[PDB]
């Protein structure tokens, strides 16, 4: 009766899907031995001796190579040919690893489990390659997670040319380190963590009675144990040195000391000390307003009293070891024939695709689409005929592209794709750079392995996709042939392009009379024009320019130099297929006035592939981009590397140097690179760069290598929990977890190391009683550690962070970043909304770390805790009531201000970003009354890829619960001033982001590189236009925002 | 001029209607203090926007009295004689013909469930594809490793022959078979151990081809789901566009979808 008795014959439930127990997608990675995660606790290992004997020891999993060697030679005595062995000391272990390389085991402290051994056996040898020192490349390769030799046997010259030339940059940074050492060395390691502006916002300034803060300088005297407060009240804009003096003044005033006698005891003492933050390895190493250090400014905001420590410079320069940098082991055709000589069209011979997997039943016929590009295309897109369709497909056609060979621009790239047949549908794709890194036009035969079309791409050809062949062999391999001109054709010198450009201008100066299609060509320009230009300049990147506007721009390009910021628009108005034009543009960009980094960053996205342009863009960064702001946008700068044509480029040389100049950048630069290493689109590129970094980074490698080792332990641990210890009680799992963590290999590996989330924090001992597996199906780990600071107590005795194997953190990573940026925009522009962009860090393929925020609860917990016994309904007030229960007195009033100031900003970020729908289990409130969202899901409305269409959703819809709390408990809250003010925050917040919209477009545009399904192409990002309403006037935007806000709320909102 | 087939009268949803249409496909759009109308044309597969006292036009050759006047002229003809690099001229703008409105709306849910069921199958297989790409490559590296292991053992069964047959002929009578048995034993272990390892490597390679077989069958069926997913989605987009001509009903839609 229910189903019209219609039987579904195919359906079965004898296990029929991972919808049933629907969680934990990514796999796989075998761990401690081949084909098993965690090696047996007692295990048999074949020791291959130099006398050819296989003695098999039973070893414990956990045992050191010292212990194994020492037993092996006790037990080799019982086997024959003992007189043929040397004293054990003349030997080192070796075996084949899981990476598939015969690794010499030098560091004999390492344990059998920690070796990554593939088969459980050990060969004994006397140590070949007498530079024991140098074959701590294995350190580098451990950190990188692919062995350094793997490059050394790469054929490709570029790669080797990258490896050897990049050391230029590496040595230059190491020079800057040991320049005023040991101070500069500390300056590398412990850069001053500092806001960009010294200037204070007006809502901070008011927290300090005309710019004064009670600080607390601490000191130690004998033996260590006892410490002493010294509770200063110094100026906000006073520097560490002055703060160090006043502390020592008050330390050493005395009744046995005249003032004149004190002043002298100040001077001697003063500059023997520097300031630490109590509880973490941060320091105040340079002349910066105390307020400008991030720790101080947070202590102001949070209503806290900074606890700094006076630290002796020598007990500091004790803890910095030497950088010890070393140059590694690894240290055209008679003026060629200029591309402009070459007198022919472009033609490219397609040949045969070999490995094309298609149903001959389903698909009729298949062809190779082609085209030339620069981001957008310099000619009509062409294909080849539908020949030998499906069964063994072959076309030996010369395709003819209507562009003259000289009008190819430096950054030109062929983009092709095999397709199905209007049954039009791509099978594979691949793109090739038409020149190589040596400037040489591509000639003869090339063999290109192709990439599968990703999720979001319906389109036929995909030029934003990575340039070069797939490394994956068993895929469609479409080989092809380029035209040969009896000579290697090189791209023109700049000296030569400078001459053609100078000629092209002088030439235009005598073009005469009417030139209708004025289009691409007056010295004195009209005032209405000079206003239609700045009007263009202000427009965001995704407001696409017309042909009129382009031609209009291109003609007035020489005026466009007065308005530098136009450059992005200008450049997209050039006919890149007219070297006449392109050359002239190369002479503007030469001496174009440098621009702001937030604007110059656009110029490193996929829409600006020209090298000259990207140079200008790095030139901007080199000038304006501070180590602060670089660090802020480092994710977008690592991602934008993908869009570069060649390995070796100015942007890599920039970022690499910065990474080696400053270790806090270095840190994240390692991890973001390392994060992506599983992605074969960049494995090579990033590996090479990571080698360079690792080689030149100094002692930090050894710190990284422990962080890395800890992450691998946890990856394995969870991998096992997630398979075979699934379908098991928490009880049983948690037993297994704790059991494992107590083995000494885990104890070594998971204890004394730095937080990848923030290497300033140390991570000490595991308190395993506070370690546990959360309830989520992904089997995240809630891990807890002792803060081994001298002053643990003053900051936090326990550092706890969440490790989650199974979930792609980078969406979260970016939304949290974007939030952080909206906050800084808002706050630094004098208006206080308190977003808590908690720390998040993807360290691998759906593996990461999320910062714990102590004393915060999902609204659900609040309501479970506040729910009445007889299970009836949860009360809207309980939130309010649970909040009051914490905040009582003058406190209460201020906690509502917070809840209101946070809830407002989170409303506006959420709406604008369009993140996954908010609800009780993903919204959190802290004891002090701050609200903040977690688990963002898909950012730019990525469940609109099913239906969607002008949905402009409101994801944070403020139920009664929230409204009650905003309005201090009144009824009909929608009508109070409590609320009026709230709305006026929401409007003021919304416009601030709307005036910086350029940046947030560009940040999302820079992120197209990463293979996030939420960021497939520019129309994905276009959601942020509607939602900011950038096609409209601000007054309509305000009204649009209200409209949008009102309808979801059924509310007031005018 | 309101109807005008191609004439709709913002940037984003234009590009959605210009997504996956071939070389020459076009439509017209409407800040007004900027310009009035906007011919958005997709030449060669890229959005090419063209700006528009009575006479509508692109710049100076203004003698065309209407929006419809200017577009009929350039349906016949290319845009080269107006502006240099423009050598292209599809004014694109079934559904069982249904005037039902409601029963057209049920089909939208049905096609969307078909589509959303279809996207998951495509999504599933994309994970299978890449996991299989990984599992495969891990097998390949493992094979290099096995092969490498084997060398070290083959070298070890050789390594001993040099030293062991030096310690047979020197002496010989001393511990005659008391020595040379227990050197033969160790060696008879060593070669059968190789024997096992090789068989372990083979057995991976047979699994390699069965995995690489399945790997083809994923792509194979991905490429037969793909073309269906494009049409299934495109038919959904015309069913949804056909509705949103007559009754506005932007909000009613979301129950079906
Ligand atoms: C530059 C560009 C082209 N040519 C096509 C579509 C989007 C964008 N942003």
What is Rg of chain B? 36 Å
- Beta strand count of chain B: 3
- Just give the CATH class of the domain at 97-244 in chain B: Mainly Alpha
- Give the amount of beta strand of chain B, in percent: 5-15%
Shape of chain A: globular
Compute the separation of the termini of chain B in Å.
Answer: 33 Å
Which range best describes the helical content of chain A: under 10%, 10-25%, 25-40%, 40-55%, 55-70% or over 70%? 25-40%
Q: Tell me roughly what share of residues is in helical segments of chain B.
A: 55-70%
Bound molecules: 2-methylbenzene-1,3-diamine
Please give the largest β-sheet of chain B: 3 strands, antiparallel
CATH architecture of the domain at 494-703 in chain A: Alpha Horseshoe
Distance between the ends of chain A:
51 Å
PDB class: transferase/transferase inhibitor
Keywords: lipid kinase, phosphoinositide, 3-kinase, signaling, transferase, TRANSFERASE-TRANSFERASE INHIBITOR complex
Assembly: dimeric
Entry title: Crystal Structure of PI3Kalpha in complex with fragment 18
Description:
Chain B: One of its GO terms (biological process) is positive regulation of tumor necrosis factor production. The complex is a heterodimer of chains A (1054) and B (257). Chain A starts with 41 loop residues before the first strand and ends in a 5-residue tail after the last helix. Chain A has 35 helices and 32 strands. Chain A is α+β, with helices and mostly antiparallel strands and 1054 residues long. Among the domains of chain A are: 339-482, C2 domain (Immunoglobulin-like, Sandwich); 494-703, Alpha Horseshoe (Serine Threonine Protein Phosphatase 5, Tetratricopeptide repeat), CATH 1.25.40.70. With 257 residues, chain B is mostly helical. Chain B has a domain at 97-244: Helix Hairpins. In chain B, 62% of the residues lie in helices and 6% in strands. Chain B is built from 6 helices and 3 strands. The interface between A and B is large, with 81 and 93 residues. Bound molecules: 2-methylbenzene-1,3-diamine. 2-methylbenzene-1,3-diamine is lined by residues 376, 607, 1018 of chain A. 2-methylbenzene-1,3-diamine (71K) binds at residues 376, 607, 1018 of chain A.
């Amino acid at each position: 009766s229910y189903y019209h008795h219609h039987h579904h014959h195919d359906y079965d439930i004898p296990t029929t899907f991972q919808g049933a127990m629907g969680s934990m997608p990514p796999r796989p990675s075998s761990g401690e031995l081949w084909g098993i995660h965690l090696m047996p606790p007692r295990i048999l290992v074949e020791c291959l001796l130099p006398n050819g004997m296989i003695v098999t020891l039973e070893c414990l999993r956990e045992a050191t190579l010292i212990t194994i060697k020492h037993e092996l030679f006790k037990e080799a005595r019982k086997y024959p040919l003992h007189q043929l062995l040397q004293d054990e000391s003349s030997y080192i272990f070796v075996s084949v690893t899981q990476e598939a390389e015969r690794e010499e085991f030098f560091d004999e402290t390492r344990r059998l489990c920690d070796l990554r051994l593939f088969q459980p056996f050990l060969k004994v040898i006397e140590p070949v390659g007498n530079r024991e020192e140098k074959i701590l490349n294995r350190e580098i390769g451990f950190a990188i997670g692919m062995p350094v030799c793997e490059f050394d046997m790469v054929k490709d010259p570029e790669v080797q040319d990258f490896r050897r030339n990049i050391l230029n940059v590496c040595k230059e940074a190491v020079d800057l380190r040991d320049l005023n050492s040991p101070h500069s060395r500390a300056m590398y390691v412990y850069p001053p963590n500092v806001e960009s502006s010294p200037e204070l916002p007006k809502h901070i300034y008011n927290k300090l009675d005309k710019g004064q803060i009670i600080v607390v300088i601490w000191v130690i005297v004998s033996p260590n144990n006892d410490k002493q407060k010294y509770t200063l009240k110094i100026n906000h804009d006073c520097v560490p040195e002055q703060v160090i003096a006043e502390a020592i003044r008050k330390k050493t005033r005395s009744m046995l000391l005249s003032s004149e006698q004190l002043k002298l005891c100040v001077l001697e003492y003063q500059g023997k000390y520097i300031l630490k933050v109590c509880g973490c390895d941060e320091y105040f190493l340079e002349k910066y307003p105390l307020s400008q250090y991030k720790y101080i400014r947070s202590c102001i905001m949070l209503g806290r009293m900074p606890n700094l420590m006076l630290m002796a410079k020598e007990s500091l320069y004790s803890q910095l070891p030497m950088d010890c940098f070393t140059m590694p082991s690894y240290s055209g055709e008679t003026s060629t024939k200029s591309l402009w000589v070459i007198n022919s069209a472009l033609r490219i011979k397609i040949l045969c695709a070999t490995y094309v997997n298609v149903n001959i039943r389903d698909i009729d016929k298949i062809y190779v689409r082609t085209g030339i590009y620069h981001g957008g295309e310099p000619l009509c897109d062409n294909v080849n005929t539908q020949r030998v369709p499906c069964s063994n497909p072959r076309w030996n056609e010369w395709l003819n592209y209507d562009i003259y060979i000289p009008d190819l621009p430096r950054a030109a790239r062929l983009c092709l794709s095999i397709c199905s047949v209007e049954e039009h549908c791509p099978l594979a794709w691949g793109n090739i750079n038409l020149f190589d890194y040596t400037d040489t036009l591509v000639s003869g035969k090339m063999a290109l392995n192709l990439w599968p079309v990703p999720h979001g791409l319906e389109d036929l050809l995909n030029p934003i996709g990575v340039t070069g062949s797939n490394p994956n062999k068993e895929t469609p391999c479409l080989e092809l042939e380029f035209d040969w001109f009896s000579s290697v054709v090189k791209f023109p010198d700049m000296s030569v392009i400078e001459e053609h450009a100078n000629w092209s201008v002088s030439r235009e100066a005598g073009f005469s009379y009417s030139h209708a299609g004025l289009s691409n060509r007056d010295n004195e320009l009209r005032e209405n024009d000079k206003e239609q230009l700045k009007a263009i300049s202000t427009r965001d990147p995704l407001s696409e320019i017309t042909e009129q506007e382009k031609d209009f721009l291109w003609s007035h390009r020489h005026y466009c130099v007065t308005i530098p910021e136009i450059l992005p628009k200008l450049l997209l108005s050039v006919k890149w297929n007219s070297r006449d034009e392109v050359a002239q543009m190369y002479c503007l960009v030469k001496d174009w006035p440098p621009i702001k980094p937030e604007q110059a960053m656009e110029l490193l996205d996929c829409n600006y592939p020209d090298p000259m342009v990207r140079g200008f863009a790095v030139r901007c960064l080199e000038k304006y981009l501070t180590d602060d702001k670089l660090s802020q946008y480092l994710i977008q700068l690592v991602q934008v590397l993908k869009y570069e044509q060649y390995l070796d480029n100015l942007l890599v040389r920039f970022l690499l140097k910065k990474a080696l100049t400053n270790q806090r950048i270095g840190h994240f630069f390692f991890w973001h690179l390392k994060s992506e290493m599983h992605n074969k689109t960049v494995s090579q590129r990033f590996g090479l760069l990571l080698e360079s970094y690792c080689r030149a980074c100094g002692m930090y490698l050894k710190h990284l290598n422990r962080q890395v080792e800890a992450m691998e332990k946890l990856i394995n641990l969870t991998d096992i929990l997630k398979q075979e210890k699934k379908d098991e009680t928490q009880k049983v799992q948690m037993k297994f977890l704790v059991e494992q963590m107590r083995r000494p290999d885990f104890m070594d590996a998971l204890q004394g190391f730095l937080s990848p989330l923030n290497p300033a924090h140390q991570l000490g001992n595991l308190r395993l009683e506070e370690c546990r597996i959360m309830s989520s199906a992904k089997r995240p780990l809630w891990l807890n550690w002792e803060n081994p600071d001298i002053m643990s107590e003053l900051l936090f005795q326990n550092n706890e962070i969440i490790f989650k194997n199974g979930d792609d953190l980078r969406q979260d990573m970016l939304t949290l970043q974007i939030i952080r940026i909206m906050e800084n925009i808002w706050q630094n522009q004098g208006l206080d909304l308190r977003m808590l962009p908690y720390g998040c860090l993807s360290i691998g393929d759906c593996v990461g770390l999320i910062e714990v925020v102590r004393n915060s609860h999902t609204i659900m917990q609040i309501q479970c805790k506040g729910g009445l016994k007889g299970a009836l309904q949860f009360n809207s007030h309980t939130l309010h009531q649970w909040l009051k229960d914490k905040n009582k007195g003058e406190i209460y009033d201020a906690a509502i201000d917070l809840f209101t100031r946070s809830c407002a900003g989170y409303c506006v970020a959420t709406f604008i970003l369009g993140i996954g729908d908010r609800h009780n289990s993903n919204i959190m409130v802290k004891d002090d009354g701050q609200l903040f969202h977690i688990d963002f899901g898909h950012f730019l409305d990525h469940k609109k890829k099913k239906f969607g269409y002008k949905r402009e959703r409101v994801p944070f819809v403020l139920t009664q619960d929230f409204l009650i709390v905003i309005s201090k408990g009144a009824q009909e809250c929608t009508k109070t001033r409590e609320f009026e003010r709230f709305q006026e925050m929401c409007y003021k917040a919304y416009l601030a982001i709307r005036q910086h919209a350029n940046l947030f477009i560009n940040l999302f545009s820079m992120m197209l590189g990463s293979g996030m399904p939420e960021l497939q192409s520019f129309d994905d990002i276009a959601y942020i236009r509607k939602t900011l309403a950038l096609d409209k006037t601000e007054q309509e935007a305000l009204e649009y925002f209200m409209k949008q806000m009102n309808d979801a709320h059924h509310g007031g909102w005018t | 001029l309101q109807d005008a087939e191609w004439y709709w009268g913002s940037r984003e949803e234009v590009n959605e209607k210009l997504r996956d249409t071939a070389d020459g496909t076009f439509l017209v759009r409407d800040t007004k203090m900027h310009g009035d109308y906007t011919l958005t044309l997709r030449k060669g597969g890229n959005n090419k926007l063209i700006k528009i006292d009575g006479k509508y036009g692109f710049s100076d050759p203004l003698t065309f009295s209407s929006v419809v006047e200017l577009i009929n002229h350039y349906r016949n003809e290319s845009l080269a004689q107006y502006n240099p690099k423009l050598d292209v001229k599809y004014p694109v703008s079934q559904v069982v013909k249904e005037d039902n409105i409601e029963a057209v709306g049920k089909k939208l849910h049905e096609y969307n469930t078909q589509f959303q069921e279809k996207s998951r199958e495509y999504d599933r297989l994309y994970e299978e594809y890449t996991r299989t790409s990984q599992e495969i490559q891990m097998k390949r590296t493992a094979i290099e490793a096995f092969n490498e292991t084997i060398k070290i053992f083959e070298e070890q069964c050789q390594t001993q022959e040099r030293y062991s047959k030096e310690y047979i002929e020197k002496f010989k009578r001393e511990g005659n078979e008391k020595e040379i048995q227990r050197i033969m034993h160790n060696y008879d272990k060593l070669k059968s151990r190789i024997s096992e390892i090789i068989d372990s490597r083979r057995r991976l390679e047979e699994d390699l081809k069965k995995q690489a077989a399945e790997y083809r069958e994923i792509d194979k069926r991905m490429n037969s789901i793909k073309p269906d997913l494009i049409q299934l989605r495109k038919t959904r987009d015309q069913y949804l566009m056909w509705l949103t001509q007559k009754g506005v009903r932007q909000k009613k839609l979301n129950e079906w979808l």
